[PDB]
Amino acid sequence: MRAKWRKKRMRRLKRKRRKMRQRS
Amino acid sequence: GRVIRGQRKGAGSVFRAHVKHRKGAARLRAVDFAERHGYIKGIVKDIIHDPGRGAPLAKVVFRDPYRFKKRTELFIAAEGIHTGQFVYCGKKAQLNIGNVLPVGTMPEGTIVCCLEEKPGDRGKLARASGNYATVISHNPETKKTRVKLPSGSKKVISSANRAVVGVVAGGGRIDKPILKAGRAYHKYKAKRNCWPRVRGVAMNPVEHPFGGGNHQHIGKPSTIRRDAPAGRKVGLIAARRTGRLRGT
Amino acid sequence: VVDPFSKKDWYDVKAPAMFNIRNIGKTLVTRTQGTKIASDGLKGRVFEVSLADLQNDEVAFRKFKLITEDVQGKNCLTNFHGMDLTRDKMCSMVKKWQTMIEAHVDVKTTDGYLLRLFCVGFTKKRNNQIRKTSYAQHQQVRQIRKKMMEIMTREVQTNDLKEVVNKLIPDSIGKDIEKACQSIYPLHDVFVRKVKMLKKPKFELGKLMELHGE
RNA sequence: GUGAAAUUCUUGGACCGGCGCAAGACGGACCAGAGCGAAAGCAUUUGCCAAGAAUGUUUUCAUUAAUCAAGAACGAAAGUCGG
RNA sequence: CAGGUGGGGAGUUUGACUGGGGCGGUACACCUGUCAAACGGUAACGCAGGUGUCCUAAGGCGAGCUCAGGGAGGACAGAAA
RNA sequence: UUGAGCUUGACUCUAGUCUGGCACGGUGAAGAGACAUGAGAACUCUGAUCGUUUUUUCACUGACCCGGUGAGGCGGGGGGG
RNA sequence: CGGCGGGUGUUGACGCGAUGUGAUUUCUGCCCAGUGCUCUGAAUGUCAAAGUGAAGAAAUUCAAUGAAGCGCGGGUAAACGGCGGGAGUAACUAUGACUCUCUUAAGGUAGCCAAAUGCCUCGUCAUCUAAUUAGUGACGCGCAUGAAGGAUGAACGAGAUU
RNA sequence: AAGCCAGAGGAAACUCUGGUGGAGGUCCGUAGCGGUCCUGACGUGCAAAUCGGUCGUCCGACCUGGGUAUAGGGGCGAAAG
RNA sequence: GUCUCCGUAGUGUAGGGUAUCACGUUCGCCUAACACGCGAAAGGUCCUCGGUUCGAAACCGGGCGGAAACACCA
Numbered sequence A: 001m002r003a004k005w006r007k008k009r010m011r012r013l014k015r016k017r018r019k020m021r022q023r024s
Numbered sequence B: 001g002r003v004i005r006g007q008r009k010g011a012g013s014v015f016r017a018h019v020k021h022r023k024g025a026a027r028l029r030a031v032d033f034a035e036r037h038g039y040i041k042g043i044v045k046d047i048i049h050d051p052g053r054g055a056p057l058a059k060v061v062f063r064d065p066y067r068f069k070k071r072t073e074l075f076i077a078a079e080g081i082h083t084g085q086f087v088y089c090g091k092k093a094q095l096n097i098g099n100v101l102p103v104g105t106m107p108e109g110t111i112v113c114c115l116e117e118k119p120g121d122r123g124k125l126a127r128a129s130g131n132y133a134t135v136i137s138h139n140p141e142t143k144k145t146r147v148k149l150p151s152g153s154k155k156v157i158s159s160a161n162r163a164v165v166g167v168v169a170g171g172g173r174i175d176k177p178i179l180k181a182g183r184a185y186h187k188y189k190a191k192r193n194c195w196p197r198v199r200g201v202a203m204n205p206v207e208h209p210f211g212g213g214n215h216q217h218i219g220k221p222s223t224i225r226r227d228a229p230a231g232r233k234v235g236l237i238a239a240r241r242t243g244r245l246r247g248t
Numbered sequence C: 001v002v003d004p005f006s007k008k009d010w011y012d013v014k015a016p017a018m019f020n021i022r023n024i025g026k027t028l029v030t031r032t033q034g035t036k037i038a039s040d041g042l043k044g045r046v047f048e049v050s051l052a053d054l055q056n057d058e059v060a061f062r063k064f065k066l067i068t069e070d071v072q073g074k075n076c077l078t079n080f081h082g083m084d085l086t087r088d089k090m091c092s093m094v095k096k097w098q099t100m101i102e103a104h105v106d107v108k109t110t111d112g113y114l115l116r117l118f119c120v121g122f123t124k125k126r127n128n129q130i131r132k133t134s135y136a137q138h139q140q141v142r143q144i145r146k147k148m149m150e151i152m153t154r155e156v157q158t159n160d161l162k163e164v165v166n167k168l169i170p171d172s173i174g175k176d177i178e179k180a181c182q183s184i185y186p187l188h189d190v191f192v193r194k195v196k197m198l199k200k201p202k203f204e205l206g207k208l209m210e211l212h213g214e
Numbered sequence D: 001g002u003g004a005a006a007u008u009c010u011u012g013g014a015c016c017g018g019c020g021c022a023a024g025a026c027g028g029a030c031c032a033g034a035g036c037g038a039a040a041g042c043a044u045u046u047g048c049c050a051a052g053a054a055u056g057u058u059u060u061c062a063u064u065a066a067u068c069a070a071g072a073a074c075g076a077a078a079g080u081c082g083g
Numbered sequence E: 001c002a003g004g005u006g007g008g009g010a011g012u013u014u015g016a017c018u019g020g021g022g023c024g025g026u027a028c029a030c031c032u033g034u035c036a037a038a039c040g041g042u043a044a045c046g047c048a049g050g051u052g053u054c055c056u057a058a059g060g061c062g063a064g065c066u067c068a069g070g071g072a073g074g075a076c077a078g079a080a081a
Numbered sequence F: 001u002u003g004a005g006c007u008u009g010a011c012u013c014u015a016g017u018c019u020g021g022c023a024c025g026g027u028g029a030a031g032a033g034a035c036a037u038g039a040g041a042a043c044u045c046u047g048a049u050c051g052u053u054u055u056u057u058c059a060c061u062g063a064c065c066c067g068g069u070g071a072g073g074c075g076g077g078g079g080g081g
Numbered sequence G: 001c002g003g004c005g006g007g008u009g010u011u012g013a014c015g016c017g018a019u020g021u022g023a024u025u026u027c028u029g030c031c032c033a034g035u036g037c038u039c040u041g042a043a044u045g046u047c048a049a050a051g052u053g054a055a056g057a058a059a060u061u062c063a064a065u066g067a068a069g070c071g072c073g074g075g076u077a078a079a080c081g082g083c084g085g086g087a088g089u090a091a092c093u094a095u096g097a098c099u100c101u102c103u104u105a106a107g108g109u110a111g112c113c114a115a116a117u118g119c120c121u122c123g124u125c126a127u128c129u130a131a132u133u134a135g136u137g138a139c140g141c142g143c144a145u146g147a148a149g150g151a152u153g154a155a156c157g158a159g160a161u162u
Numbered sequence H: 001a002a003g004c005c006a007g008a009g010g011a012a013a014c015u016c017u018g019g020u021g022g023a024g025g026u027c028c029g030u031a032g033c034g035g036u037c038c039u040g041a042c043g044u045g046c047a048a049a050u051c052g053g054u055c056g057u058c059c060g061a062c063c064u065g066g067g068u069a070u071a072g073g074g075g076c077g078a079a080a081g
Numbered sequence I: 001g002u003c004u005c006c007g008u009a010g011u012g013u014a015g016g017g018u019a020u021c022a023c024g025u026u027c028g029c030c031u032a033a034c035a036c037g038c039g040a041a042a043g044g045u046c047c048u049c050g051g052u053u054c055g056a057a058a059c060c061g062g063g064c065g066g067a068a069a070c071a072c073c074a
């Protein structure tokens, strides 16, 4: 991928991870 | 089958304004020879808080031009005026904050505080706190002045209408959140019986068009025509549009 | 169905006495019908006409507006409204490696005409100059702008619009501006680039008729 | 309007031309391997307000300096909040 | 005075039968066969169905023919011309 | 074939509202026509005068309406500057 | 009931009046076909009384004209409200990223869930118990979740539950 | 809670510590006001709605006397017809 | 249970006088080849049976299925 889009994908995944952890 | 709230407000019985501690009608001085041809000087003797309104009122004392007496007025305080200040009212008054002079004599960009709707009544426009009108344009022929009101509308008035120079005091009163039902109660207790407002959907069908149902829903379009009978025109009255106001 | 040009009748457009060619040309308007007056239709028209076809042997890059105030008989009669340089002349004057100074001033004549004047000047390189560019420093530019703003007001405030127009016909104002500025930085292409009417005084018909006739 | 079209606007006068009015943006050409600023950045006129480099100096103080963990100010655009 | 709008308000109505009522159905006006007990009559929300039409002829008269089906034959022709 | 509370796309109305007409309800012009004496040519078609006819536009004030005031200097003119 | 009567109003858009949602945080997706509301009358179709013209002896009849409204045309969903099917398809099976069509005004987005909303149902898995139609966590083709209300989040509650 | 004093640390920006102060539709809890649960008592009662214990709130949208105003398809309603 | 609707190429669908559209399938082009594209072709007891009609996929009854909607007050 383009590095910028890998960065964007990582940011989306990190928001999802934060939401999952906050749910606990 | 029951008269609704809002219909009951016109009879006035419980819904008359609470005017017990109000300090008087806030008005310019009546136009006379001094206003019409020169100026008359008064002194701001006090600035007071009128219950029910957010604008301070200015108690100004003038000299009676025809008999030995002192005339006290209750101007609406333009912001920046202070006690012990001289304010001048008439055609030959100068542009200063608090002076009263006809709009036709004012330049093409000045802004004004207590504007007259008709040439000779006292102030009627831009009276609420923080508000002002703007003198846009003149034409010496037909003696007309075009002004911009706080609502953004444009109005043509006579050039002989008087107004106070400046913005009315009381600042950005609506900026502070009320934060409390108690503060709202104390706010409206000084104004009138209107505050604790029950939603119509929470009522029964007998006292509201929107009342009733097993779920709290309106059940009919909330926009209502202009010529609807009283007891029916509740909701968005003659609305040209609904929604979110995206763009203007 | 019938062509509307059957109901059009022609009028002759007349320039003031400042120009020795009085015939601007011809215009047309629909004949009077009902409340619609051909006089009202003809009034308020602007005729962007060059200077070479208004004055006998003047330059061609200068245009005059010549708005119509009053029509009598078959003659529309015009009066000064503004002037402008032409697009090609203005674009040819702008060149690289030189500084142009632009000034504007609002000034009232003796007879109540308010004018906005726009003047341009361009830095001139000397004949023996080896350096490519001819740039004036900012203080020199400010002094030149101030000079050419204060020697446009004294040619307008102290005289009538008639002898303002007849002296901006040869651009005497630009010539004296250029002569004055030589002690600060030399200038070569100095013109009153534009003038526009801002306000007019009440349209005295006697004044219009003395502008046209005598 | 496009490669071509179409969505769209049009005998209700659209586009075009003329004269006005209003609003909010934007400061062309001049504009450069030019300037200034710690960088980010900075271009309509005029005025006010402090600031600054370089230069000039047979002025003054006399080592008061250089770089700098921690800490501090500013920091395009996008984004967020209130008007 | 006229037209529009007008549950804001007024007055009123919101069929019947029915193995309770409602939903369903129409057994609510008719016609055929049966029920039906060899005169006639005879019931269920009994059974099997049909009707709110169609026809200047599909009405009227006269004349002349014979229908469905099958068998046997006949160029194309065949299960059917 | 008794009601009442409430709703509405039931039936029949109704307060209020929107709109047209008539009356209060006038005075001048300017348009465009139908106006009415008329005039050009039963001999074949055009310019006018005052009233009237509509419809529009503009203006006036005197009916009518609003605001201010203890109805306190309004309009025109003459001084004097 | 009525008077140019009265309330808001001793008021003037930072104000009155009418609604919906309901602190904060974070979001508030698509649909103007329907029903409403509203804007524009443009040649405009329909359109009462009065008024105009004609026929008649008159009653009367006919015709022309064309107010609002309705039609015609735009806007609007933090207006009422609404937000789909049927097949095939990946080198074990299984699902279906993907592909076809039918159709809508748009086909339910972000989220959330057997939830106070899930029939089937005591759903399936995990945890809690010796044993749980209960509780919690998770899953989701969800009979019939869902965005001015969705999802959260401290503090609080004579609220419901383990 | 803000405001204030002192000490200490900092180059500054400011920070830390101890006091002071006394805010709040703040907490516990009298009187008052209310009325959760026992589904207690009583239920031909003390009472045509009361009593006991337990409870909610208790500086505020607080409690309350008197004087006024609003009247029946009307009033008034922080909304339960 | 009651009421209503549907059954058409392999697929999703249109429709009383010789069954349409699109995809799919076949063949030939183009390409080194596949796909795309281009030119042609094939394909359907119109669910089953009976009836009306000169003639039924249609119209009308019966049956096979499939799909919706009701299935309430005690």
Ligand SMILES: [Mg+2]
Residues within 6 Å of the ligand: B197, B198, B199
């Ligand atoms: Mg509310």
Ligand SMILES: [Mg+2]
Residues within 6 Å of the ligand: B202, B203, B204
């Ligand atoms: Mg309720």
Ligand SMILES: [Mg+2]
Residues within 6 Å of the ligand: B001, B205, B206, B208, B209
């Ligand atoms: Mg109602």
Ligand SMILES: [Mg+2]
Residues within 6 Å of the ligand: B201, B209, B210, B211, B212, B213, B216, B217, B218, B219
């Ligand atoms: Mg309701």
Ligand SMILES: [Mg+2]
Residues within 6 Å of the ligand: none
């Ligand atoms: Mg609904």
Ligand SMILES: [Mg+2]
Residues within 6 Å of the ligand: none
């Ligand atoms: Mg930025």
Ligand SMILES: [Mg+2]
Residues within 6 Å of the ligand: none
């Ligand atoms: Mg913002």
Ligand SMILES: [Mg+2]
Residues within 6 Å of the ligand: E007
């Ligand atoms: Mg009723």
Ligand SMILES: [Mg+2]
Residues within 6 Å of the ligand: none
């Ligand atoms: Mg017998």
Ligand SMILES: [Mg+2]
Residues within 6 Å of the ligand: none
């Ligand atoms: Mg018998």
Ligand SMILES: [Mg+2]
Residues within 6 Å of the ligand: none
């Ligand atoms: Mg016979």
Ligand SMILES: [Mg+2]
Residues within 6 Å of the ligand: F001
């Ligand atoms: Mg009976």
Ligand SMILES: [Mg+2]
Residues within 6 Å of the ligand: none
């Ligand atoms: Mg009844």
Ligand SMILES: [Mg+2]
Residues within 6 Å of the ligand: F009
């Ligand atoms: Mg109806």
Ligand SMILES: [Mg+2]
Residues within 6 Å of the ligand: none
């Ligand atoms: Mg609210």
Ligand SMILES: [Mg+2]
Residues within 6 Å of the ligand: none
């Ligand atoms: Mg109409």
